[PDB]
Amino acid sequence: ATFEIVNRCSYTVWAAASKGDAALDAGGRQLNSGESWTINVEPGTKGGKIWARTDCYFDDSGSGICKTGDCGGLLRCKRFGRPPTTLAEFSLNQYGKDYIDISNIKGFNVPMDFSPTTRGCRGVRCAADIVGQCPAKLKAPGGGCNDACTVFQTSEYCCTTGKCGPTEYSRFFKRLCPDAFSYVLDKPTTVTCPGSSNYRVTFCPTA
Hints:
By secondary structure, the chain is mostly beta strands. The protein has helices spanning about 130-135, 150, 155-160, 170-175; strands at about 1-5, 15-20, 25-30, 35-40, 50-60, 65-70, 85-95, 95-105, 110-115, 125, 190-195, 200-205. About 45% of the residues are buried.
């Protein structure tokens, strides 16, 4: 499946793509403002994610640090990134179908649209200014808006027992972005697409 990742933000981002224990495609690449990077993701990929990382420094071997979404200091991500990270999440060819969503469960750094480029389903988007409006206690001094699990490490925010409810913090993300997951048991905003669809992830789709 092809995912065209487009950076419409006015700042550089370093895109990242991983299924948690492996890179997808090259796993990561710099995207200056306006640049598009097309990756290939193997059919059947389950629990894949794409995100942006901000304010990265890498040396000549691809080792360094990002202020958001850092994936163990690598340019080419092999593992998931450090919160806060707005997440494009997908499982492809799962019994005939693809499933996509956007999640704020690991916080928010960059606004995102995640849409099919082929027929048969709608895209999802979380493009509101969550960083500017972020509650004081969730603001990440590094940049971005942390989820409450990351900040407070409770059973209730992290949904550790499988039995949690919405919270004042989850409701803030859900208010600004109704179409993204705001906590682990949120009512699903997953979109079912035809198996083997292709997609585009656009950072800052409205700015």
